[PDB]
Amino acid sequence: EFILEQMRLCLAVKDYIRTQIISKKINTKFFQEENTEKLKLKYYNLMIQLDQHEGSYLSICKHYRAIYDTPCIQAESEKWQQALKSVVLYV
Numbered sequence: 001e002f003i004l005e006q007m008r009l010c011l012a013v014k015d016y017i018r019t020q021i022i023s024k025k026i027n028t029k030f031f032q033e034e035n036t037e038k039l040k041l042k043y044y045n046l047m048i049q050l051d052q053h054e055g056s057y058l059s060i061c062k063h064y065r066a067i068y069d070t071p072c073i074q075a076e077s078e079k080w081q082q083a084l085k086s087v088v089l090y091v
Contacts, residue, residue: 047060048063
């Protein structure tokens with residue numbers, strides 16, 4: 001949480017390069033979602049904003065495919081519908 005929090009602060013500063021620099025320290029430290037789903041959701045909801053800046057239209061597809069985590073995501077049709085719609089829209 002500590003190392004993830006300052007990413008939003010850097011976004012507030014509007015310094016994308018530093019955000020992309022600091023984000024690389026969490027890629028290998030996955031499987032933190034075994035008991036903390038909301039932390040994983042918060043993490044994924046930031047690279048979407050980050051990559052939307054310049055032109056990256058395919059990595060965000062990978063993120064939305066990664067929103068296929070614990071059925072605490074897909075058992076909520078009211079938002080699961082658009083969660084699975086946006087991936088096929090962005091492909």
